[PDB]
């Protein structure tokens, strides 16, 4: 039995009046008959006199005043578990693909509290990805947040698919993709490419397109986070992909502007920091399991002081930068080793050997970048015999970082390789310490581990 009635409709903001003893709480879900379809409304504010103010999760057109409203007493609930894998869903957990109903076993509310102080894991642990560049220069911690700063054409989506595959296969976890403000064409392309690469079954996709009202784009991240939290409770390790945190911030700004709250500096919502913390704090390592996040970041004006980047960076544990310049050399993955950083790269976290190897590699590459200016301006003759050695070693290092991905086999025509942390550490330590110096530089390109590099040199 419907108990409320609509009293105001102003764009996406819908006001509903309930009997004084039945006013729904905040964040609850309502539904109404918008012609021939059910329209879900999310409660935002409880006004005096039983009037509630809600944001419509859909097209608001065609709503009449006085329509009956059914008060679902639980918050927005979405299906979770193994059944979601390989399926495309909207913010409401309805299937967007034509592949029929989801065989749900549970439905979970999207709004839940963060793990308590006593539930957090009692250790810091690295999440070995199997990619040489990432595992060496920007190691992932379990439960850490990772930002992607690369542009377009730099192989971002192939890196995402490779990470999904490696976590699903080499580990025993699952992945979730949250399309916050996705472009529909790009979402279709991503779905088809994941189908071709045969990684679709391993990952669950929830899409909020740009054409949706602001509420859907704002809440769509929470649905993916809830499914990831479901996967974590089973004891696995989970990867959560957020396609643009910046669009999450903008959707929150739009919602707050619609509600008519007072704006904040540079026009953002006054609740910017808390809205960011609510999402980010649920991505942590619990005793049962951990959720790890890779989030694409956008800088509104290349201004790193803007409140959105300033808030985002406070939660990021590592930064991965993709550059088209390295892709011009044919090196893949096109990860910049000089700008990519991780605050796990510390002797007390990764150990002294890893720290020393990474610092050595970075210093060698910086020195090479310095000497390239000398080589260009004055020529190789100026270079001493010690600087020629560092130039050759830097070229060999810069080509060793290449790696063939299992999902990129259609491009290179070579089988993918998985490299453990110790293997790449030992290989780079060897290259720096002067063993393997006699090999041709092309023996390191796209080879894999060093034990495969020596084999490649034997026939190269």
């Amino acid at each position: 039995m419907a108990t409320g009635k609509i009293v105001q409709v102003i764009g996406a903001v819908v006001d509903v009046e309930f009997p004084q003893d039945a006013v729904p709480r905040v964040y609850d879900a309502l539904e109404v008959q918008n012609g021939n379809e059910r329209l879900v409304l999310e409660v935002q504010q409880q006004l005096g006199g039983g009037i509630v103010r809600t944001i419509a999760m859909g097209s608001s057109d065609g709503l009449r005043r006085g329509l009956d409203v059914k008060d679902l007493e639980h918050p927005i609930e979405v299906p979770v578990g193994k059944a979601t894998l390989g399926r495309i869903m909207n913010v409401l957990g309805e299937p967007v693909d034509m592949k029929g109903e989801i065989g749900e076993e549970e439905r979970w509310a999207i709004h839940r509290a963060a793990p308590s102080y006593e539930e957090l894991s009692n250790s810091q642990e690295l999440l070995e990805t199997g990619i040489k560049v990432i595992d060496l220069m920007a190691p992932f911690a379990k439960g850490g947040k990772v930002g992607l700063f690369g542009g377009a054409g730099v192989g971002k989506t192939v890196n995402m698919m490779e990470l999904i595959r490696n976590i699903a296969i080499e580990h025993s976890g699952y992945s979730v993709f949250a399309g916050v403000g996705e472009r529909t064409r790009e979402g279709n392309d991503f779905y088809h490419e994941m189908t071709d690469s045969n990684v679709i079954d391993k990952v669950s996709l929830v899409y909020g397109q740009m054409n949706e009202p602001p509420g859907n784009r704002l809440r769509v991240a929470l649905t993916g986070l809830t499914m990831a939290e479901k996967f974590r409770d089973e004891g696995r390790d989970v990867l959560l992909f957020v396609d643009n945190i910046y669009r999450y911030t903008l959707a929150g700004t739009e919602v707050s502007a619609l509600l008519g709250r007072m704006p904040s500096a540079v026009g953002y919502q006054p609740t910017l920091a808390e809205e960011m913390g609510v999402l980010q704090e649920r991505i942590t390592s619990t005793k049962t399991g951990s959720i790890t996040s890779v989030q694409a970041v956008y800088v509104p004006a290349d201004d790193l002081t803007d409140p959105s980047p300033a808030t985002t960076f406070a939660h990021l544990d590592a930064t991965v930068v993709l550059s088209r310049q390295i892709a011009s050399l044919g090196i893949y993955p096109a990860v910049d080793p000089l700008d990519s950083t991780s605050r796990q790269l510390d002797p007390l976290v990764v150990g002294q050997e890893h720290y020393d190897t990474a610092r050595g590699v970075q210093s060698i590459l910086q020195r090479y970048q310095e000497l390239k200016d000398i080589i260009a301006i004055l020529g190789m003759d100026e270079l001493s015999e010690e600087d020629k050695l560092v130039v050759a070693r830097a070229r060999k290092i810069q080509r060793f970082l290449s790696q063939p991905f299992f999902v990129a086999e259609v491009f290179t025509g070579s089988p993918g390789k998985y490299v453990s942390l110790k293997d790449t550490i030992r290989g780079f330590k060897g290259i720096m310490e002067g063993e393997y110096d006699h090999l041709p530089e092309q023996a390191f390109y796209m080879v894999g581990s060093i034990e495969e590099a020596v084999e490649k040199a034997k026939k190269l």
């Binding site: 009293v7 105001q8 409709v9 102003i10 764009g11 996406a12 006001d15 097209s59 608001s60 057109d61 065609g62 709503l63 009449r64 005043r65 006085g66 495309i88 967007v96 693909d97 034509m98 377009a152 472009r183 529909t184 064409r185 979402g187 279709n188 392309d189 779905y191 088809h192 899409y207 397109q209 740009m210 054409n211 009202p213 602001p214 903008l250 700004t253 739009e254 919602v255 707050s256 502007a257 619609l258 509600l259 008519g260 704006p263 026009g267 509104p300 004006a301």
Partner: protein, 510 residues
């Protein structure tokens, strides 16, 4: 404390009989008129976006449904309206005529013809507000749309169903590029729609005259909302054009729609929102300004054969459909960090930056490479053009850096000298006259000439005459090859050898 529609006679009516609901919900009365926005008392059954009929065969759109009154915007002249006029809520959402008959006609955003050429033959009506096809319905864009400009078609491919933002400062040629892209589709299967928002009527009349002069008007639908028309008409106008374009897309045909000055639509919507007292956001735009442009642009898409088959009830089976949108955004002072420009940049699939400095310089097309980009890229491009354009891309990339060395290039490596005199000649070649679109055969021919080093000995001052002479020569002596290239756009050794023969034979002349 202030009054909220508490006026003496309504209160007296409520005094007499409180249950005034006994009167039909279908009607109401105007209680306020100001700046084109009216407040209506009654209309208990009104709904968002509903058309409300006014005296004089005018209409208003119900946008604010408040607890005591309905706020509506007049879609026409409003100065003669007065409070106490009766209004009746027609139970219809805003709809416009659609069909093939609209082609060649000039209509306002309501679908009323304004060209003076009589009524419109039309295949029914479609709702102005609509929902874009879902993710599963879309299909990847891999088909070319030829603008007829060497620079655009070479470095910035446009695919059928792509959204390509034309952006630049005032008086940089955005309108010229849009209308020339309209002209080039005259002999292709693509049908064009030109939507004028906030333009002055003389400019639109001149544009229509130029369209009819080159013969493209018969393939174009013109939707006009002049600067003197009600803000609601200007704001709704792009959506009507999209609805007209969606007619072809769903039936399995290709359409190209151009929105002129989306910034003017945003200004009109801001005016409407502020007159309705909705909370302002950054730069006084309403909160959902991004939603406004996003839901409009997402309609431009390519749909798979199964969506077309389902929609047409199986009458069309093997055809996909597409709608290509070319929105126009005007940056005030080269600022792409403004609000509406940032939103439109984030929405679209690519950008064509027109620069005022280059326009002042000799390069009339003024397209700026290195900042313009198409995320669809080579998939939108024909095989021969895709093969050839990489040379241009890399040549300009190299030329950009050497421009600093141009001041004192007398003392340089001869390799650098060659790169510089090649970039300069390519940049000189890319310029093109207005209203003169080049077929794919001619663009491919001149690109082949530039890339294969045949311009190495030609002087920078004479590039244009060389191009014109080559085009006339190939049009005179080798028409079949141009026909085959225009028909297929294929590339192979049998074609490269023929082109080599063409260029060697031409180089003996002129």
């Amino acid at each position: 404390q202030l009054n909220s529609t508490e006026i003496s006679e309504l209160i007296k009516q409520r005094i007499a009989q409180f249950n005034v609901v006994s009167e039909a919900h279908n009607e109401g009365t105007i209680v306020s008129v100001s700046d084109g926005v009216i407040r209506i008392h009654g209309l208990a059954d009104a709904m968002q976006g509903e058309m409300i009929s006014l005296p004089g065969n005018r209409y208003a759109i119900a946008l604010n449904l408040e607890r005591d009154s309905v706020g509506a915007v007049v879609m026409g002249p409003y100065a003669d309206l007065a409070e106490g006029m009766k209004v009746k809520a027609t139970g219809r959402i805003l709809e416009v005529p659609v069909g093939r008959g609209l082609l060649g006609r000039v209509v306002n955003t309501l679908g009323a013809p304004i060209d003076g050429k009589g009524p419109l033959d039309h295949d029914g009506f479609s709702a102005v507000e609509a929902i874009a096809p879902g993710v599963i319905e879309r299909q990847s864009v891999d088909q070319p749309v030829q603008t007829g400009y060497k620079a655009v078609d070479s470095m910035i491919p446009i695919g059928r169903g792509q959204r390509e933002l034309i952006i630049g400062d005032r008086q940089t040629g955005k309108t010229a590029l849009a209308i020339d892209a309209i002209i080039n589709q005259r002999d292709s299967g693509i049908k064009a729609i030109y939507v004028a928002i906030g333009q002055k009527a003389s400019t639109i009349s001149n544009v229509v005259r130029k369209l009819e002069e080159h013969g493209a008007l018969a393939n174009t639908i013109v939707v006009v909302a002049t600067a003197s028309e009600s803000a609601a008409l200007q704001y709704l106008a792009p959506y009507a054009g999209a609805a007209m374009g969606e007619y072809f897309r769903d039936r399995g045909e290709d359409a190209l729609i151009i929105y002129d000055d989306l910034s003017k639509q945003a200004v009109a919507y801001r005016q409407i929102s502020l007159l309705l007292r909705r909370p302002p956001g950054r730069e006084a735009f309403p909160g959902d300004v991004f939603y406004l442009h996003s839901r409009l642009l997402e309609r431009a898409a390519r749909v798979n054969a199964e969506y077309v088959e389902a929609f047409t009830k199986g009458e069309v089976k093997g055809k996909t459909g597409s709608l290509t949108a070319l929105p126009i955004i005007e940056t005030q002072a080269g600022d792409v960090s403004a609000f509406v420009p940032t939103n439109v940049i984030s929405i679209t699939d690519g950008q064509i930056f027109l620069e005022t400095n280059l326009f002042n310089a000799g390069i009339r097309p003024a397209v700026n490479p290195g900042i313009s980009v198409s995320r669809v890229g080579g998939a939108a491009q024909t095989k021969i053009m895709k093969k050839l354009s990489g040379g241009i891309r890399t040549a300009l990339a190299q030329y950009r850096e050497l421009a600093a060395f141009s001041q004192f290039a007398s003392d340089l490596d001869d390799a650098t000298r060659k790169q510089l005199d090649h970039g300069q000649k390519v940049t000189e070649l890319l310029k093109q006259k207005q209203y003169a679109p080049m077929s794919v055969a001619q663009q491919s021919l001149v690109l082949f000439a530039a890339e294969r080093g045949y311009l190495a000995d030609v002087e920078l001052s004479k590039i244009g005459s060389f191009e014109a002479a080559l085009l006339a020569y190939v049009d005179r002596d080798h028409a079949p090859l141009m026909q085959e290239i225009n028909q297929t756009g294929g590339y192979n050794d049998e074609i490269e050898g023929k082109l080599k023969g063409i260029l060697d034979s031409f180089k003996a002349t002129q």
